[PDB]
C-alpha cells in the first residue's frame, strides 16, 4: 500500500500539475488498492 | 458541496455539526456560511429534480438515522443555525422513502417548551404539506404509539399533550393562521380519541391534567362517538373529576367539568352515561369523603400473666377498636359540593 | 354587579370577625372559578372588595390560573427560507424553492415568468418530482408548444391536485380556476379537462364542509354532476374516478329517481359505475313494493355475484383480475367506500351478508334476495368474507 | 456437492473479506498456515468465482424502490397482498433488504385485514430475526397491536409474541405485562404464550 499508493498520488497530482487522462486512471487504481490498504491510501 | 453531497456515508453528521459549529478567521466563517447555503441548495436540487428512476444522496441516507438529534439541535434555537437544521430537516423528511416527516412532527412536538418551538413545528409541516400529505395521522399515530409504550418517557408525554392542546386551541381560534396552514388538527386529534382517553388516569399528574385539558378543548368525530368511545371518555373524564377534585380541590376541576358537559352534550345516552357515572362516584365510599360523608401478641400474654387463669375466656375476638373518627374543613366539603352540582346544571 | 353590590353590602368589612371574611373571600374566588368568560372574572377581580378581601399573591395567582385556561399564542406559518443573489445559480435555486412552497396562482405565475425570463427554457415543470398528474392528463398537458404555458399549467394542475388531496379546497380551487381562465384562451380540450376537475373539487368541497351537516347541494352541482354524466364528449381525455365520484354523489343525496329512470342507455352500457347506481337507487326506492323490489333485488344480486365470482379453482384477491362480473372486486369496494348513504349501505351490508350465509348472519333486508343460485362453485366465498368484514368495519365507522 | 452450499459459501466467505479488512495480520497468518487446502479447494472448485477473487487478492436500495412506492400508496387489500408476496418471496433469497421496509410495514402490522396483517408480521419477524438490533425499535407498534381495539389484531400480537419477545429482551418484562393486562380485562387467555415466552426468557436470563 504504502509507498506504491503514495507515488501513484504524486503522479496524478504531477501530472495534473503540468496540465495546469491520468487523473481519472490514478483514482480508479487508487479505489481498485484501496481494498487492502484503503487506511495507508487516507494516511497518505 | 457535490462532494459533500454524493460522498459522505457514515460521518455525515459529525461532519455537519463541525460544519455548522464552524458557520455558527472570519473569512473562514462566510466561507463555511457560503458552504452551507449551497449545500443546502444543491440538496433541493437533488431531491427535487426529474419528475422517473429514483435519486439516491448518501448524505441524506446517513443523516437519516440521525434525525431526533437533528430535531433536538433545531429546538435549542441558536440564532441562525436553526434556519438551516429545519431547512435541512424538511429536505431530508422529503428525500425518505418511507417519508419520514411525522417522525420528525413528533420528535419536536414532544419536545417543544415554548411557543416559538411549536411556531417551529407548524413551520416544518407547513413546508412539508406542499409536497407530503397525511402527515399529522401518521405522526399522531407514531407518538401515542411511543406513549403507551415504555419510550416517551412522562416530561415528553405531558409536553406532547400541552404542544398539541395548543394547537387545536390555536386552531379553533379562526384567525388568518389557521386557514392558511390547513392542518386540521383537531380531526386527526379526534381520529386517536380512544388512544388519549386512558392518559386520563395517568399515575403522573401532569400527564393527567394536560390530557385532560386536550381532551377538554378537542372536537370530538363528527360523525359520532361509539358506545366503547363514548363509556371510556365518560369514565376517565369522572374519574379525573373526582381525583383532581380531591388534588388540586375545586379550582383544578375545569378540564374536567369541560369535557363531561361536552360529552352530555353530545347525545341523550351520554347525558345519561355522564349524570349516572357522576352521582354513583360521588356517592361511592370513595370520595364521600369530598362532599361531608361519614367513612407480640403471645409475648405480652405472658407478661401480664396468679398461676390460674380467673377468666374462663375471652368473648368473641377481645376488645373493639379504638372506633372510627372523621375530620375535614366543612368549607371545602361546601365548595367540593358546589363545584359537583355547578357541573351537574 | 348586583352580586358584588349585596357582598359589599352585607359583610361589614373590619366589623366581623375573620370567619366571615374568609368565607366571603372563598365565596368570590369559587365564583369567578365557575365563571367562564375572561373579561367576567377580570370585573368581578376589580371589584374593590375582592381586592382588599385576599392578599396580593394569592390574587395575582388566582388570576394567572384564570387566564391560563384559554391562552392565546401566535405561531409562526411562513416555511423557513434563507435568502442568503451572490450569484445567479443560488437566485434560480431560490425562486425554485418558492415556487415549490407557493400555493398561490399569482406569485407562481411571477415566479415562473421570472425564471424563464432568467433562462433559456430549462423546462421547470420537472423542477419537483412529488408534483404529480395522472399519465392520460400528462399526455395532452406537456403537448403545449409555448414552455411558459406548459410548465404553468403542469405546476397549476398538480398543486390543484395535491391541495384536493390534503383538503387545502380553498387554495385549490383559487389555482384550479388560475388554470381554467389561463386554458379557455388558447384550447377547448384542457378547458374540459378544467372544467371536469373543477366539478371533482366542488364535489369534495361538499362532502367536506357541507356534507356531514344536513344541508342539501345548491341544486346547480347536481346539475352540473349531471350533466358530466350525460356529456359524452367523445375526444376528451377522462379519468373513471370523476364518473365514481359523480355517481357516489348522486347515491348520497338520495337522487334515486334520476339514476333509476333519466339516466341514458349507452352510459350504462358503457360504463359499470352508472350500472351499478341505477341498480342501487332502483332497489332502495321500491322497498315497500314486493315485486319490484325482489326483481331489482335479484338484478343487483346476479350482478354482484358475477364480481365476486372468479373464472378457472383460484383466490381472487390474490390476481385482482379474472372475475366474471363487470368490475373489479377492489374497484366495488373503493366504489363502496365513497358511498355515505345509511339506506345503500344498509342494502350493501344485507346483501353480502346473504352472499355469506350462502356458504349465520341475520340482516333486516336479508329477505328479499333470491335463495337458490346458479355458479354456486364460481363464487369465491374467501373473498366474500374479506368483503363483508371490511364493508361492516367501513360501514360502523360511517355510523357507529 | 458445492452447489447445495451456496448460502454457506457465501457467507463463510464474507467472513473472511471481514477477516482480512479489520485484522489483516493474523488472517494473512492463517491462510499461509491452511494454503494448500485453499490452493486445492481453488482447482477443485473453480466455480466458486468470489474464492479466486480472494486468490487475485493474495445497488441493493435501487432496486426497492417501486416496491416501497406500491406498497406505501397502496390501498386496496389486493395490492397490499400483492406487493407484501412480492417482498415475501425474494427476501427469502435476499434477507437483508427487510431493513429497508420496516417503518413501511409497521403500520401494516396494525393493518384490521387478516391476512395483509399475517404477512407484514411474519415479514417484520424474519426481518428482525435477521438483524436483532432492529427489534427494539419494532416495540411501540407491538404494543399499540396489543393493546388496540381491533380484537384480530391482539390476536395476531399474541400469535407472534413468544417469538418477539425472544428477540427483544429488555423490554420483554413490558411487553408480557401489557400481554398479561390485555389477558385479564380482554377475556382471552394468553396464559399458553406467555408461558412459553416466560419459559424461553427464564432458561436464557436466569437459568
Same mark, same amino acid.
Given at each position: 500500500?504504502?509507498?506504491?499508493?503514495?507515488?501513484?498520488?504524486?503522479?496524478?497530482?504531477?501530472?495534473?500539475?503540468?496540465?495546469? !487522462?491520468?487523473?481519472?486512471?490514478?483514482?480508479?487504481?487508487?479505489?481498485?488498492?484501496?481494498?487492502?490498504?484503503?487506511?495507508?491510501?487516507?494516511?497518505? | 458541496?457535490?462532494?459533500?453531497?454524493?460522498?459522505?456515508?457514515?460521518?455525515?453528521?459529525?461532519?455537519?455539526?463541525?460544519?455548522?459549529?464552524?458557520?455558527?478567521?472570519?473569512?473562514?466563517?462566510?466561507?463555511?456560511?457560503?458552504?452551507?447555503?449551497?449545500?443546502?441548495?444543491?440538496?433541493?436540487?437533488?431531491?427535487?429534480?426529474?419528475?422517473?428512476?429514483?435519486?439516491?444522496?448518501?448524505?441524506?441516507?446517513?443523516?437519516?438515522?440521525?434525525?431526533?438529534?437533528?430535531?433536538?439541535?433545531?429546538?435549542?434555537? =441558536?440564532?441562525?443555525?436553526? &434556519?438551516?437544521?429545519?431547512?435541512?430537516?424538511?429536505?431530508?423528511?422529503?428525500?425518505?422513502?418511507?417519508?419520514?416527516?411525522?417522525? /420528525?412532527?413528533?420528535?419536536?412536538?414532544?419536545?417543544?417548551?415554548?411557543?416559538?418551538?411549536?411556531?417551529?413545528?407548524?413551520?416544518?409541516?407547513?413546508?412539508? #404539506?406542499?409536497?407530503? +400529505?397525511?402527515?399529522?395521522?401518521?405522526?399522531?399515530?407514531?407518538?401515542?404509539?411511543?406513549?403507551?409504550?415504555?419510550?416517551?418517557?412522562?416530561?415528553?408525554?405531558?409536553?406532547?399533550?400541552?404542544?398539541?392542546?395548543?394547537?387545536?386551541?390555536?386552531?379553533?381560534?379562526?384567525?388568518?393562521?389557521?386557514?392558511?396552514?390547513? /392542518?386540521?388538527?383537531? =380531526?386527526?386529534?379526534?381520529?386517536?380519541?380512544?388512544? &388519549?382517553?386512558?392518559?386520563?388516569?395517568?399515575?403522573?399528574?401532569? #400527564?393527567?391534567?394536560?390530557?385532560?385539558?386536550?381532551?377538554?378543548?378537542?372536537?370530538?368525530?363528527?360523525?359520532?362517538?361509539?358506545?366503547?368511545?363514548?363509556?371510556?371518555?365518560?369514565?376517565?373524564?369522572?374519574?379525573?373529576?373526582?381525583?383532581?377534585?380531591?388534588?388540586?380541590?375545586?379550582?383544578?376541576?375545569?378540564?374536567?367539568?369541560?369535557?363531561?358537559?361536552?360529552?352530555?352534550?353530545?347525545?341523550?345516552?351520554?347525558?345519561?352515561?355522564?349524570?349516572?357515572?357522576? #352521582?354513583?362516584?360521588?356517592? %361511592?365510599?370513595?370520595? *364521600?369523603?369530598?362532599?361531608?360523608?361519614?367513612?407480640?401478641?403471645?409475648?405480652?400474654?405472658?407478661?401480664? %400473666?396468679?398461676?390460674?387463669?380467673?377468666?374462663?375466656?375471652?368473648?368473641?375476638?377481645?376488645?373493639?377498636?379504638?372506633?372510627?373518627?372523621?375530620?375535614?374543613?366543612?368549607?371545602?366539603?361546601?365548595?367540593?359540593?358546589?363545584?359537583?352540582?355547578?357541573?351537574?346544571? | 354587579?348586583?352580586?358584588?353590590?349585596?357582598?359589599?353590602?352585607?359583610?361589614?368589612?373590619?366589623?366581623?370577625?375573620?370567619?366571615?371574611?374568609?368565607?366571603?373571600?372563598?365565596?368570590?374566588?369559587?365564583?369567578?372559578?365557575?365563571?367562564?368568560?375572561?373579561?367576567?372574572?377580570?370585573?368581578?377581580?376589580?371589584?374593590?372588595?375582592?381586592?382588599?378581601?385576599?392578599?396580593?399573591?394569592?390574587?395575582?395567582?388566582?388570576?394567572?390560573?384564570?387566564? $391560563?385556561? +384559554?391562552?392565546?399564542?401566535?405561531?409562526?406559518?411562513?416555511?423557513? *427560507?434563507?435568502?442568503?443573489?451572490?450569484?445567479?445559480?443560488?437566485?434560480?435555486?431560490?425562486?425554485? %424553492?418558492?415556487?415549490?412552497?407557493?400555493?398561490?396562482?399569482?406569485?407562481?405565475?411571477?415566479?415562473?415568468?421570472?425564471? %424563464?425570463?432568467?433562462?433559456?427554457?430549462?423546462?421547470?415543470?420537472?423542477?419537483?418530482?412529488?408534483?404529480?398528474?395522472?399519465?392520460?392528463?400528462?399526455?395532452?398537458?406537456?403537448?403545449?408548444?409555448?414552455?411558459?404555458?406548459?410548465?404553468?399549467?403542469?405546476?397549476?394542475?398538480?398543486?390543484?391536485?395535491?391541495?384536493?388531496?390534503?383538503?387545502?379546497?380553498?387554495?385549490? $380551487?383559487?389555482?384550479?380556476?388560475?388554470?381554467?381562465?389561463?386554458?379557455?384562451?388558447?384550447?377547448?380540450?384542457?378547458?374540459?379537462?378544467?372544467?371536469?376537475?373543477?366539478?371533482?373539487?366542488?364535489?369534495?368541497?361538499?362532502?367536506?364542509?357541507?356534507?356531514?351537516?344536513?344541508?342539501?347541494?345548491?341544486?346547480?352541482?347536481?346539475?352540473?354532476?349531471?350533466? @358530466?354524466?350525460?356529456?359524452?364528449?367523445?375526444?376528451?381525455?377522462?379519468?373513471?374516478?370523476?364518473?365514481?365520484?359523480?355517481?357516489?354523489?348522486?347515491?348520497?343525496?338520495?337522487?334515486?329517481?334520476?339514476?333509476?329512470?333519466?339516466?341514458?342507455?349507452?352510459?350504462?352500457?358503457?360504463?359499470?359505475?352508472?350500472?351499478?347506481?341505477?341498480?342501487?337507487?332502483?332497489?332502495?326506492?321500491?322497498?315497500?313494493?314486493?315485486?319490484?323490489?325482489?326483481?331489482?333485488?335479484?338484478?343487483?344480486?346476479?350482478?354482484?355475484?358475477?364480481?365476486?365470482?372468479?373464472?378457472?379453482?383460484?383466490?381472487?384477491? $390474490?390476481?385482482?383480475?379474472?372475475?366474471?362480473?363487470?368490475?373489479?372486486?377492489?374497484?366495488?369496494?373503493?366504489?363502496?367506500?365513497?358511498?355515505?348513504?345509511?339506506?345503500?349501505?344498509?342494502?350493501?351490508?344485507?346483501?353480502?351478508?346473504?352472499?355469506?350465509?350462502?356458504?349465520?348472519?341475520?340482516?333486516?333486508?336479508?329477505?328479499?334476495?333470491?335463495?337458490?343460485?346458479?355458479?354456486?362453485?364460481?363464487?369465491?366465498?374467501?373473498?366474500?368474507?374479506?368483503?363483508?368484514?371490511?364493508?361492516?368495519?367501513?360501514?360502523?365507522?360511517?355510523?357507529? | 456437492?458445492?452447489?447445495?452450499?451456496?448460502?454457506?459459501?457465501? !457467507?463463510?466467505?464474507?467472513?473472511?473479506?471481514?477477516?482480512?479488512? @479489520?485484522?489483516?495480520?493474523?488472517?494473512?497468518?492463517?491462510?499461509? !498456515?491452511?494454503?494448500?487446502?485453499?490452493?486445492?479447494?481453488?482447482?477443485?472448485?473453480?466455480?466458486?468465482?468470489?474464492?479466486?477473487?480472494?486468490?487475485?487478492?493474495?445497488?441493493?436500495?435501487?432496486?426497492?424502490?417501486?416496491?416501497? !412506492?406500491?406498497?406505501?400508496?397502496?390501498?386496496?387489500?389486493?395490492?397490499?397482498?400483492?406487493?407484501?408476496?412480492?417482498?415475501?418471496?425474494? +427476501?427469502?433469497?435476499?434477507?437483508?433488504?427487510?431493513?429497508?421496509?420496516?417503518?413501511?410495514?409497521?403500520?401494516?402490522?396494525?393493518?384490521?385485514?387478516?391476512?395483509?396483517?399475517?404477512? /407484514?408480521?411474519?415479514?417484520?419477524?424474519?426481518?428482525?430475526?435477521?438483524?436483532?438490533?432492529?427489534?427494539?425499535?419494532?416495540?411501540?407498534?407491538?404494543?399499540?397491536?396489543?393493546?388496540?381495539?381491533?380484537?384480530?389484531?391482539?390476536?395476531?400480537?399474541?400469535?407472534?409474541?413468544?417469538?418477539?419477545?425472544?428477540?427483544?429482551? =429488555?423490554?420483554?418484562?413490558?411487553?408480557?405485562?401489557?400481554?398479561?393486562?390485555?389477558?385479564?380485562?380482554?377475556?382471552?387467555?394468553?396464559?399458553?404464550?406467555?408461558?412459553?415466552?416466560?419459559?424461553?426468557?427464564?432458561?436464557?436470563?436466569?437459568?
Amino acid at each position: 500500500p504504502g509507498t506504491i499508493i503514495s507515488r501513484v498520488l504524486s503522479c496524478g497530482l504531477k501530472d495534473f500539475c503540468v496540465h495546469g !487522462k491520468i487523473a481519472s486512471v490514478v483514482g480508479i487504481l487508487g479505489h481498485l488498492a484501496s481494498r487492502h490498504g484503503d487506511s495507508i491510501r487516507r494516511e497518505l | 458541496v457535490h462532494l459533500v453531497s454524493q460522498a459522505s456515508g457514515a460521518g455525515a453528521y459529525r461532519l455537519l455539526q463541525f460544519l455548522v459549529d464552524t458557520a455558527m478567521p472570519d473569512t473562514v466563517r462566510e466561507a463555511c456560511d457560503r458552504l452551507i447555503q449551497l449545500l443546502l441548495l444543491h440538496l433541493q436540487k437533488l431531491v427535487h429534480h426529474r419528475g422517473p428512476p429514483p435519486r439516491l444522496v448518501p448524505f441524506l441516507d446517513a443523516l437519516k438515522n440521525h434525525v431526533g438529534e437533528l430535531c433536538g439541535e433545531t429546538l435549542r434555537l =441558536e440564532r441562525k443555525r436553526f &434556519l438551516w437544521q429545519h431547512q435541512l430537516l424538511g429536505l431530508l423528511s422529503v428525500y425518505t422513502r418511507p417519508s419520514c416527516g411525522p417522525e /420528525a412532527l413528533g420528535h419536536l412536538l414532544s419536545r417543544a417548551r415554548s411557543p416559538e418551538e411549536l411556531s417551529l413545528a407548524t413551520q416544518l409541516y407547513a413546508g412539508l #404539506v406542499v409536497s407530503l +400529505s397525511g402527515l399529522l395521522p401518521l405522526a399522531f399515530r407514531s407518538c401515542l404509539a411511543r406513549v403507551h409504550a415504555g419510550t416517551l418517557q412522562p416530561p415528553f408525554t405531558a409536553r406532547f399533550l400541552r404542544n398539541l392542546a395548543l394547537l387545536v386551541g390555536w386552531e379553533q381560534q379562526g384567525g388568518e393562521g389557521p386557514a392558511a396552514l390547513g /392542518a386540521h388538527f383537531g =380531526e386527526s386529534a379526534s381520529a386517536h380519541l380512544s388512544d &388519549l382517553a386512558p392518559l386520563l388516569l395517568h399515575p403522573e399528574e401532569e #400527564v393527567a391534567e394536560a390530557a385532560a385539558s386536550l381532551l377538554a378543548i378537542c372536537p370530538f368525530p363528527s360523525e359520532a362517538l361509539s358506545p366503547s368511545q363514548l363509556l371510556g371518555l365518560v369514565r376517565a373524564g369522572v374519574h379525573r373529576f373526582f381525583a383532581s377534585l380531591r388534588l388540586h380541590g375545586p379550582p383544578g376541576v375545569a378540564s374536567a367539568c369541560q369535557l363531561l358537559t361536552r360529552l352530555s352534550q353530545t347525545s341523550p345516552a351520554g347525558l345519561k352515561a355522564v349524570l349516572q357515572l357522576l #352521582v354513583e362516584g360521588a356517592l %361511592h365510599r370513595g370520595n *364521600t369523603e369530598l362532599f361531608g360523608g361519614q367513612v407480640a401478641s403471645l409475648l405480652d400474654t405472658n407478661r401480664r %400473666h396468679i398461676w390460674s387463669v380467673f377468666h374462663a375466656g375471652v368473648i368473641g375476638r377481645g376488645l373493639k377498636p379504638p372506633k372510627f373518627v372523621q375530620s375535614r374543613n366543612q368549607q371545602e366539603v361546601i365548595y367540593n359540593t358546589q363545584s359537583l352540582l355547578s357541573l351537574l346544571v | 354587579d348586583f352580586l358584588l353590590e349585596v357582598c359589599s353590602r352585607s359583610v361589614n368589612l373590619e366589623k366581623a370577625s375573620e370567619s366571615l371574611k374568609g368565607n366571603m373571600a372563598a365565596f368570590l374566588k369559587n365564583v369567578c372559578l365557575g365563571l367562564e368568560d375572561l373579561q367576567y372574572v377580570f370585573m368581578i377581580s376589580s371589584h374593590e372588595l375582592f381586592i382588599t378581601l385576599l392578599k396580593d399573591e394569592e390574587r395575582k395567582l388566582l388570576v394567572d390560573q384564570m387566564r $391560563k385556561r +384559554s391562552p392565546r399564542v401566535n405561531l409562526c406559518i411562513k416555511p423557513v *427560507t434563507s435568502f442568503y443573489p451572490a450569484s445567479a445559480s443560488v437566485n434560480i435555486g431560490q425562486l425554485e %424553492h418558492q415556487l415549490i412552497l407557493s400555493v398561490d396562482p399569482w406569485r407562481i405565475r411571477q415566479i415562473l415568468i421570472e425564471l %424563464h425570463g432568467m433562462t433559456s427554457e430549462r423546462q421547470f415543470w420537472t423542477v419537483s418530482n412529488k408534483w404529480e398528474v395522472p399519465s392520460v392528463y400528462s399526455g395532452v398537458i406537456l403537448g403545449i408548444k409555448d414552455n411558459l404555458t406548459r410548465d404553468l399549467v403542469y405546476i397549476l394542475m398538480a398543486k390543484g391536485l395535491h391541495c384536493s388531496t390534503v383538503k387545502d379546497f380553498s387554495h385549490a $380551487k383559487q389555482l384550479f380556476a388560475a388554470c381554467l381562465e389561463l386554458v379557455t384562451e388558447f384550447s377547448p380540450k384542457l378547458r374540459q379537462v378544467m372544467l371536469n376537475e373543477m366539478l371533482l373539487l366542488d364535489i369534495h368541497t361538499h362532502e367536506a364542509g357541507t356534507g356531514q351537516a344536513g344541508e342539501r347541494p345548491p341544486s346547480d352541482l347536481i346539475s352540473r354532476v349531471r350533466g @358530466y354524466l350525460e356529456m359524452r364528449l367523445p375526444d376528451i381525455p377522462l379519468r373513471q374516478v370523476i364518473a365514481e365520484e359523480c355517481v357516489a354523489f348522486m347515491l348520497n343525496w338520495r337522487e334515486n329517481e334520476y339514476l333509476t329512470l333519466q339516466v341514458p342507455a349507452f352510459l350504462l352500457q358503457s360504463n359499470p359505475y352508472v350500472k351499478l347506481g341505477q341498480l342501487l337507487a332502483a332497489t332502495c326506492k321500491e322497498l315497500p313494493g314486493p315485486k319490484e323490489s325482489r326483481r331489482t333485488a335479484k338484478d343487483l344480486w346476479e350482478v354482484v355475484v358475477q364480481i365476486c365470482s372468479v373464472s378457472s379453482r383460484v383466490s381472487l384477491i $390474490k390476481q385482482r383480475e379474472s372475475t366474471l362480473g363487470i368490475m373489479y372486486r377492489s374497484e366495488l369496494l373503493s366504489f363502496i367506500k365513497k358511498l355515505r348513504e345509511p339506506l345503500v349501505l344498509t342494502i350493501i351490508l344485507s346483501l353480502f351478508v346473504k352472499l355469506h350465509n350462502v356458504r349465520d348472519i341475520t340482516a333486516e333486508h336479508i329477505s328479499i334476495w333470491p335463495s337458490s343460485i346458479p355458479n354456486l362453485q364460481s363464487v369465491d366465498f374467501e373473498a366474500v368474507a374479506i368483503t363483508v368484514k371490511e364493508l361492516v368495519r367501513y360501514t360502523l365507522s360511517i355510523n357507529p | 456437492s458445492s452447489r447445495h452450499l451456496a448460502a454457506f459459501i457465501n !457467507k463463510f466467505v464474507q467472513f473472511i473479506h471481514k477477516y482480512i479488512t @479489520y485484522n489483516a495480520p493474523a488472517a494473512i497468518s492463517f491462510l499461509q !498456515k491452511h494454503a494448500d487446502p485453499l490452493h486445492d479447494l481453488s482447482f477443485d472448485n473453480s466455480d466458486l468465482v468470489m474464492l479466486k477473487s480472494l486468490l487475485a487478492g493474495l445497488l441493493t436500495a435501487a432496486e426497492m424502490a417501486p416496491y416501497m !412506492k406500491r406498497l406505501s400508496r397502496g390501498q386496496t387489500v389486493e395490492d397490499l397482498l400483492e406487493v407484501l408476496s412480492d417482498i415475501d418471496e425474494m +427476501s427469502r433469497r435476499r434477507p437483508e433488504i427487510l431493513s429497508f421496509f420496516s417503518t413501511n410495514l409497521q403500520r401494516l402490522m396494525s393493518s384490521a385485514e387478516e391476512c395483509c396483517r399475517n404477512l /407484514a408480521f411474519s415479514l417484520a419477524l424474519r426481518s428482525m430475526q435477521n438483524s436483532p438490533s432492529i427489534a427494539a425499535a419494532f416495540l411501540p407498534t407491538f404494543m399499540y397491536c396489543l393493546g388496540s381495539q381491533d380484537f384480530e389484531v391482539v390476536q395476531t400480537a399474541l400469535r407472534n409474541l413468544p417469538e418477539y419477545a425472544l428477540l427483544c429482551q =429488555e423490554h420483554a418484562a413490558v411487553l408480557l405485562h401489557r400481554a398479561f393486562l390485555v389477558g385479564m380485562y380482554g377475556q382471552m387467555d394468553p396464559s399458553a404464550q406467555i408461558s412459553e415466552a416466560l419459559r424461553i426468557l427464564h432458561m436464557e436470563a436466569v437459568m
